[PDB]
Amino acid sequence: QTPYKVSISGTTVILTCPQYPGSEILWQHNDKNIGGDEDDKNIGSDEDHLSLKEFSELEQSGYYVCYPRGSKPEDANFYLYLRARVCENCMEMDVMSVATIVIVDICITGGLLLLVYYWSKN
Amino acid sequence: DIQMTQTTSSLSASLGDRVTISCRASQDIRNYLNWYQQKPDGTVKLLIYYTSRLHSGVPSKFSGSGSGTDYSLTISNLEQEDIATYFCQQGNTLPWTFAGGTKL
């Protein structure tokens, strides 16, 4: 019922399983196991997250599944298909973010213009 | 949980005979059953897993079969080393539960 909570900042992708509350959580990607001591890239699974490092669009992308300990890989609730590009530090423009920048810039422009107006007036 | 039972606690068979041991389950366990062999001195080893796949180092003498809720281990010719207690363990749902075991 509760979807995955994936927070993407910079080149590291972190995704969370807020569906199995208090059990050990494992991960599988493209039906291949990821996490758990594997030396490659040090993708270190923690209590309820999976932090990819220097995410690769072509190497690391596909179905991600979250099964609790004591449950088979095929018994998890639902898969997740994650297809993203990462940068060194790119940040998105949502509608609210663009509205914020438009408002703040028009405000500062008007304010400074009128302040110079008033100062020059006297 | 899932109560895992066996038909007979002990059975007797002569040397060189093909012997089968039955294990039942309270629910369907999706063939997620493993058979364990325990020597009388205390050491115990895994014979087969997933009801059909032998384990590395276990002789092909041991074969498992069955599906659903009835599973069976069919030993081939019985040597003297083959006398032991055999345990069947589920793997379907937590907690894992063993059975009483059969003394061969």
């Epitope: 494992l26 001591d37 099964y67 300990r69 088979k72 890989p73 | -």
Partner: nanobody, 121 residues
């Protein structure tokens, strides 16, 4: 070869706490799940809980959640069970069983230890 070595008999007075050590060797200890099983009532085998050595987390059988607390010493390649409030019904042979890390190989115990015979009197 792969081998798990355990502790000895260690008779314990009732009411105490008794730490069982399972020393793993011959393989990457941080990559394989370790389980613990109990052989009481003559020959009946039961399961307590499994501890993930790399992360140190544990999942327990409902019966033994108040009876055992498991710790791992990653440096020495050992697993520890803490048996607290040791009554007379706790006297049995205790095995430490290895199994695969992930959900596809953690439901069968490939490598078993010799077992420690705990006697409580």
């Amino acid at each position: 070869e792969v081998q798990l070595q355990q502790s000895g008999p260690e008779l314990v007075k009732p009411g105490a706490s008794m730490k069982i050590s399972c020393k793993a060797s011959g393989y990457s200890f941080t990559g394989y799940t370790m389980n613990w099983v109990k052989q009481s009532h003559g020959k009946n085998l039961e399961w307590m809980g499994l501890i993930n050595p790399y992360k140190g987390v544990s999942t327990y059988n409902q019966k033994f959640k108040d009876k055992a607390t498991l710790t791992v010493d990653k440096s020495s390649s050992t697993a520890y069970m803490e048996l607290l409030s040791l009554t007379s019904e706790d006297s049995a042979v205790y095995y430490c069983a290895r199994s695969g890390y992930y959900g596809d190989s953690d439901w069968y115990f490939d490598v078993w230890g010799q077992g420690t015979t705990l006697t409580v009197f």
